[PDB]
Structure formats: structure tokens, C-alpha cells
Amino acid sequence: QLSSNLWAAVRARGCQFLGPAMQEEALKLVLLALEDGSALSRKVLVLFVVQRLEPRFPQASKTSIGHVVQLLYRASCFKVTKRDDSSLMQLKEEFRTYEALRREHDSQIVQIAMEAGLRIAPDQWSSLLYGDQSHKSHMQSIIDKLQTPA
Amino acid sequence: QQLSSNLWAAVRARGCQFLGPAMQEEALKLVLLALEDGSALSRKVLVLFVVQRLEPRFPQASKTSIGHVVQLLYRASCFKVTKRDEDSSLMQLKEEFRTYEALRREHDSQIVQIAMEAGLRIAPDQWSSLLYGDQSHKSHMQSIIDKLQTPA
Ligand SMILES: [Cl-]
Ligand SMILES: [Cl-]
Ligand SMILES: [Cl-]
Ligand SMILES: [Cl-]
Ligand SMILES: [Cl-]
Ligand SMILES: [Zn+2]
């Protein structure tokens, strides 16, 4: 019930979580393209990612990867250069490591759960987002930052 | 060949590469695919974009050789370069070269310029063979040579 309701809330907001392994690889590919400050259109960023993902993850599509990009967009990860032509995205300087990018990504899904009234604990979050229990403290610190400080 | 061997040696000596007519055609189309909308990519990311799509079709493709193809386009003044502080330089295809024909004209002209630098005299028929593997690009090659040789 809980997971189903979380992923519905994510999809309701134009976003997607592709499962722990696929999301991790999708994010590492976004990072590979943008960590040096390259400025890519959605077209080109998605082309870059889908092409490399599709062999291992056949569910990779322009639509599903676009939705992962939208999650990062909603999280304010990008500097956007607007045009008369397709707008460009760069990763903001503070988010050009996997740890940082993953922190904003994960925080955005927690905020979505808060927006939808879902009460999820660190252990549950670790399973949901990583398929393991090695990110409990990572998830606890995300939640603390979204609540009144001590 | 003598002229062919010498031409390609001259190109490679300048940090540039021509992958063969079929392969170079595909490589340039993939550069176009990444850059035709005005995206600004580092050499790193442009090479990655190209090799990831080229290598499955042409298994001899490497980051090193594709890097040399990008250098040929750079040498040919095809890019608008930007550089923010310490971050990597970014390449955009100049607006005038965002079609295959326009991009090939500048690429092909640069290779002709290299031939001239090296003192190689190659006729349009030979050029058509060299750059396209056919005899259907002789007039294209003549126009390129005339533009390099003769003021308009
Ligand atoms: Cl064309
Ligand atoms: Cl012709
Ligand atoms: Cl002809
Ligand atoms: Cl022509
Ligand atoms: Cl032509
Ligand atoms: Zn032509």
C-alpha cells in the first residue's frame, strides 16, 4: 500500500522513480553528462542517457528518462539558459557530485511524500530508494532538514 | 597511392583524424545530433555522446579517434567556444554550420587546407574518392578548392 501510494504521488507530479538500480544508473549518467558544466537541452540529455541505459534496462525510454529529469528539475538542480531554440540545463555547481545530486533527488521524493500525507521511516526509505538498509542515516538526515530544527 | 598516405599522415600529424568515408559520415551526423539545437558540450561529453552511438555500429571507434575528429572540426573553426572560470570549455556548433551539408563543407575544406599546408596537389576526382568513396562529389570538391584558391 505505502510504496504504491508513494510512486503514484511521484507520477502525479510529472516525475518518476525507476527502481533503486535503474534510478542510480540514470542519475550517474545525468551526472556524467553535466558534472563538468556542459549545457544540454532536454533532447540531448535524454538522448545521452537513454542510449546508454537501454541495453541493461529495456524500460528506458525518452518518456521515462524525461520524468527522472523532471524530478531533478522540480528539485531546482539546474541552472536554465532560456532561448527564443530549446532551453539548456546545467547542473548547479553545488550538485556536481553523486552524493550531492542524490541528496537533492532523495529530498525531493521525501517532500513529495510529505505533500501526499505519507508517513515513511528511514528504514522504509532506505529500502524504497536503495533496495538496502545502508542509507538509513542518509535518509534520517534528509528528513531532519525538512523539519523544524532542534 | 603516395598522395593518400601522405594526406592522412598530414591530417594525423595535426591531431586530427579522418575515419574513412562511411565512418566519418556517421561520426559527423552524431556531432550534428548533439549540437544542432545549440547545446554546449565539453570535448569530454561530445566525445562520449558520439562514441556511445558510433562504437556499436563501427566497433573500431575509440574515444581517442573521435577526439581527433572533434579536433578536426575545432581546427576548421566550426565551434563557438565558451569558458566559465575553472570549468571545462564548452563547444557549440556555430549557427551557420548546424546542417550536414554546411558542416561537411567546412570539414572537407579543412582537410583540403591541410593538403595545401603539406604541399599535396590532389584533383577533385581524387578528393571525391578520398572523402566520400565515390565519384559523385567532384563538383562539391571543385567548389571547395576554388574557394580556397581564388578570391571571390
Ligand atoms: Cl544537409
Ligand atoms: Cl558534387
Ligand atoms: Cl560530381
Ligand atoms: Cl556542393
Ligand atoms: Cl554535395
Ligand atoms: Zn556539397
Curated annotation (Swiss-Prot), chain A:
Widely expressed. Expressed at higher level in cerebellum, spleen, ovary and liver. It comes from the Eukaryota. It is found in: Cytoplasm, P-body; Cytoplasmic granule. Residues 1-148 are annotated as: ROQ. It is linked to Immune dysregulation and systemic hyperinflammation syndrome: An autosomal recessive disorder characterized by systemic hyperinflammation in the absence of an infectious agent or autoimmune trigger. Features include lymphadenopathy, hepatosplenomegaly, recurrent fever, and laboratory evidence of immune dysregulation with abnormal immune cell populations and increased serum levels of inflammatory cytokines. Able to homodimerize. Interacts with DDX6 and EDC4. Interacts with CCR4-NOT deadenylase complex. Interacts with RC3H1; the interaction is RNA independent. Post-transcriptional repressor of mRNAs containing a conserved stem loop motif, called constitutive decay element (CDE), which is often located in the 3'-UTR, as in HMGXB3, ICOS, IER3, NFKBID, NFKBIZ, PPP1R10, TNF, TNFRSF4 and in many more mRNAs. Cleaves translationally inactive mRNAs harboring a stem-loop (SL), often located in their 3'-UTRs, during the early phase of inflammation in a helicase UPF1-independent manner. Binds to CDE and promotes mRNA deadenylation and degradation. This process does not involve miRNAs. The RING-type zinc finger is required for proper localization to stress granules, but not to P-bodies. The ROQ region is required for CDE RNA-binding. Has 2 separate RNA-binding sites, one for CDE RNA and the other for dsRNA, both sites are important for mRNA decay. ADE RNA-binding involves an extended binding surface on the ROQ region with a number of additional residues compared with the CDE RNA. It may also be involved in localization to stress granules. This is Roquin-1. It comes from Homo sapiens. The chain holds residues 178 to 328 of 1133 of the full protein.
